[model samples]
Target chain A: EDPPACGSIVPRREWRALASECRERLTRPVRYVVVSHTAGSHCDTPASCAQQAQNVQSYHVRNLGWCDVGYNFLIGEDGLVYEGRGWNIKGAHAGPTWNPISIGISFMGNYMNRVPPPRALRAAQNLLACGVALGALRSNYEVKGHRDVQPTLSPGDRLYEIIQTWSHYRA
Target chain B: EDPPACGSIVPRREWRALASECRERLTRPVRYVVVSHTAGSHCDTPASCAQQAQNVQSYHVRNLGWCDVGYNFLIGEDGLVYEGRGWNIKGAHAGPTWNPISIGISFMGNYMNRVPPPRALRAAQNLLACGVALGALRSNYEVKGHRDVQPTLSPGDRLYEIIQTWSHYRA
Candidate 1:
């Protein structure tokens, strides 16, 4: 049940910011990373899935009552970046047990019912690349969609293809 | 679950018929053979144990029985043959699920309290040899006392050792 180390989720906006410094921290053996889709987005396309990516600072300082924006980083439909749990914060996304161990990243809005747009897909890939560059996603890292473990299918089956098809994706 | 293919336990009185036969049958994979000591005999020995061995045809066909004696074969205090369950029938004497696949052989009486007299030991060895020859037990088959699988240690630990030291037991 122990999660691997390093691999994490994030949106493009913050991904850009981290692009410069993410490497410094990503060089390690990452256990597993779950790339999340939004509430309505079925995993058919590579869209970032929702609006703002994870907002760790807000969740912690604002005590938004809800945990972090629920993700490690935010990826927007327009391929924009949203500030999330950042590098230091432990995300509240993957539930309490996985919190201390896994870096959770979620997209804003409800993609459970919808598919992400093309723009989102482009951004998601780029954002994913950031994780790969950082060495967070190692050769053995297992990349899974949220629904694989959770009761509900959050990462629609359509998008889950990348988890299996995208050679680059490592959970 | 399955019935023994060889038929019922051999009777002590009729044992002379297959004394040599059982040893020849002992050439193959014999998982484990059950052993016990005779109590009715004033003097503890395989002869006494054999004398007390059950009458196969009578017990299995007429008594409170199902098909046959639960064991594959039996050994007497006098080192005589007293067949239990025959060669092929699945024994009712083993575990609920394991019996269908396992072969069962029993030694008469509570052997834990007493060691089989040398005569009985020698006879048991010969019977075991017959068992091997008939392909009843594999050369490397594991031999476990009945007590190893169940809770009550009917076969004494010390005697189990004696069997291991002097007996041709394997699986």
Candidate 2:
């Protein structure tokens, strides 16, 4: 997902409706993130594909009755990055115990859809750097896809593959 | 960009190839970051596509050297968040003049691509939690994206727009 090329005026309530329930706070700026095209889902080997690309583009934030979207940010198949769970409130994107410290980020496409797009992957890498550049974030970084921690085919298939190599991205 | 779904191998040394000839060190788990997406070209208002995305990511981390990537951690247009500097290594991804005690993190796609991709954002959000769930890498945690810093473009136009109303995402 790309940054907002054009500005639009969405209703305030509607904006709130799309929020997440994460309680992550802004102790520091977001530096960078290492993402996987597959979130540990594989129909074949290593990480399997879930068949349907989990492009949860239509997924609502705070669907669990929370205030905002769980993730602090998010990306799209088009290679765009979006804001999730506003920065003011805490979040629950990172996971149950870790949401308060760091911001949560997620993608909109499911690799199971036959692997995420190439530009999407490249865009994700380049875009992630902004967080670190801003100062609130860092570089000594830690990278991991949802599949790495809890069970369930998260980010599914393609996303997991990106998470496999964490050291390469290290400076 | 998609993960090496079908057994793909990325040659080692990609980061080394881009790393500058300088001495740097990570401060343990000091690097922390927020996660967000810059929807490829779809949302281009808040920031330019990859160019703006790259600008936000690299501009902040000016101290590193002839480098451009910002966050200590960065995902690519491919979706893999490449590591930038490293934890414990002083960086510039937080405030205009933040402390080196913290790290940074960022994503590459425009999350606005979808409302809330449950499968995708949720998974990424979970990872976001896992990254910092352990504890504050440094001391103060500030989970944020480039947009959180300036009024310019970053993350995604739509996503940024939502940040104002989406209180939970905010810090």
Candidate 3:
């Protein structure tokens, strides 16, 4: 059973995450975490980041025909995390195999050329720790970039470099 | 009046550029073109590149509360040019003064440590040629990097070096 969730994640209502028909659930003690980036504009303000979250949901809902935004969580440059589908929900991020087994936490902007600010990076690491604490993720879960699981250049080059050095990362 | 639009640009609707909330536009025959990069993710297929474009617009419009995506055009590593605000419209790419007068063309991913593929370069050059031919830009328009106008490391270091050698580049 999952413990009460941990972390300073902005609620789905705060970012106006829409409802979806997605009903899949991930198995507890998920073994992988996939990181990605929106590759869009980066916002440093809470108000702006909230709007960014809203827009992502709008795109996924109105355009992509998905039940909701694809990721399980989103990280903001403002240093706060936004709850997407949340823990226990199966995310559509990173495609088939990994989607059912990984937690998807996408950073809110491009990070290929520039590294995410320290605050953003700190928030991500902390989020991972919280996931482990809640038993949503296995203590020994591996971290991988979206590129690692999919054929796309997501999560960006610079961020990929940084994540590769994370203690939990594996090829 | 502007000449017929040029090149094989992926239209705004195709990439799902949001409805404009009233942003500024530039005068025709613009004399400057500034290049930058998302520094986020790079995509190599039309499907992925379109997703990249949607992500950019989401950040600029939703997060930043801009009228739309900041760039006038976006280049994809897939070797396609995407229409952002496009020719004759002002883009919120560079800081104030630069944004009002220059056409901003940003690449879709970071290029500080690596370079874009040749096909992407060809698409960018061709897009510029189309801009010139359509009389939206001066035939002798100057091409500058985002770093040239702003105090940031945009457009990436390696990309900045290459654009300098472009025939239209000016110090």
Candidate 4:
């Protein structure tokens, strides 16, 4: 499978993502899910969340020299799912070892000190659920923290604890 | 005439604006211009710039619980004006004294050391000209940097230098 149906995603257009230019794609029925965090700025409203998305992308594209924002999708504190590389695209979020086969999703704030609100968490879980519903994710897909696979402080401490308790979380 | 002639302003509806409960209003023929910057992220595309506008408002209304995006209007590096409080509305951008009589037009990026593109500068000047043409601003409105009116380093030094050269700028 390739790009799955992601009905809940805030389209790249809505968040003002630049035109897609990546040629790499992930083989779907994607079995692994990785979670990270922007750890830069969190947003709480539609307007700000949209801007935050742009800022992240600009940083990734302009500063880091990436093809685009590294994650497959980004979840905002406002409880919205933002499109990043998105389903079926290979993300640069995790290290090369995991990036090729895994879909990387990140929360758009520093979750080290604070846990995302229930709405934001719910939106993320719902997005994953939809991935399964659309046959994009494997029925037994696993979720891993950014720290779990890479030597990074991503998906922060507070968030790490919360996601650990989730039904789908693994080491 | 309706308040729509403010120069290429992306309206609240065009950017998918959220509901703002702010009801305060400003007197007409605003006499002062206070310039500021979001000091957040910079955008370089129309799509990203539009998202930046929404992001600014979301921060004001949702995170800060304000009536609207604090600025009267926001100038994007992408060279377009994004409507905030619009004409004849008190902006929460500057402190109380200045907010009452000033029109706040903030650049959508950190400008302390970084200069905005010529297009962004062009847009701001055009916006001011339009405000004057629409009778929303005094033909002789005195412009001040946000630092001039507030105890903040807003509008950044780089932008401050550029605006100081404008015909209507004053200390």
Worst 10 residues of 4 chain A by lDDT: A1-10
Q: How are the candidates ranked when ordered by lDDT, highest leading?
A: 3, 4, 1, 2
Interface RMSD score of each model: 26.3, 15.8, 16.9, 16.7
Mind giving the per-residue lDDT tens digits that candidate 4 earns over B1-171? 121233445667766778667678887777999999999898865567778888888888889889888998887765557778888778898988998899999999999989987657756776787677668888778999998888888889999899899888997
Query: What TM-score does the first chain of candidate 3 have?
Result: 0.95
Query: B93-136, model 3: which lDDT tens digit per residue?
Result: 77555777899998999897889899889999999899888888
The worst-scoring run of ten residues by lDDT in candidate 3 chain B lies at B145-154
Worst lDDT 10-window in candidate 3 chain A: A145-154
Q: Where does model 4 exceed 4 Å of error?
A: A1-7, B1-171
Query: lDDT of candidate 1?
Result: 0.48
DockQ agreement of candidate 2 with the native complex:
0.03
| lDDT tens digits, residue span B40-85, model 1 | 2323444444334534333433432245444566655555666655
Native contacts conserved, per model? 0.00, 0.00, 0.00, 0.00
Question: How well does chain B match by TM-score in each candidate?
Answer: 0.64, 0.49, 0.95, 0.94
Report the interface RMSD that candidate 1 achieves against the true structure, in angstroms: 26.3
Tens digit of lDDT per residue, candidate 2, span B1-171? Answer: 212111011111333324433355545564445444534432222112234445553443454454435455544332233445544355455554443444555554555554432223322332343334434352343455556654435666654554444322444
Q: What tier of docking accuracy does candidate 4 attain?
A: incorrect
Models sorted by TM-score, best on top? 3, 4, 2, 1
Off by over 4 Å in 3: A1-5, B1-171
Best by lDDT: 3
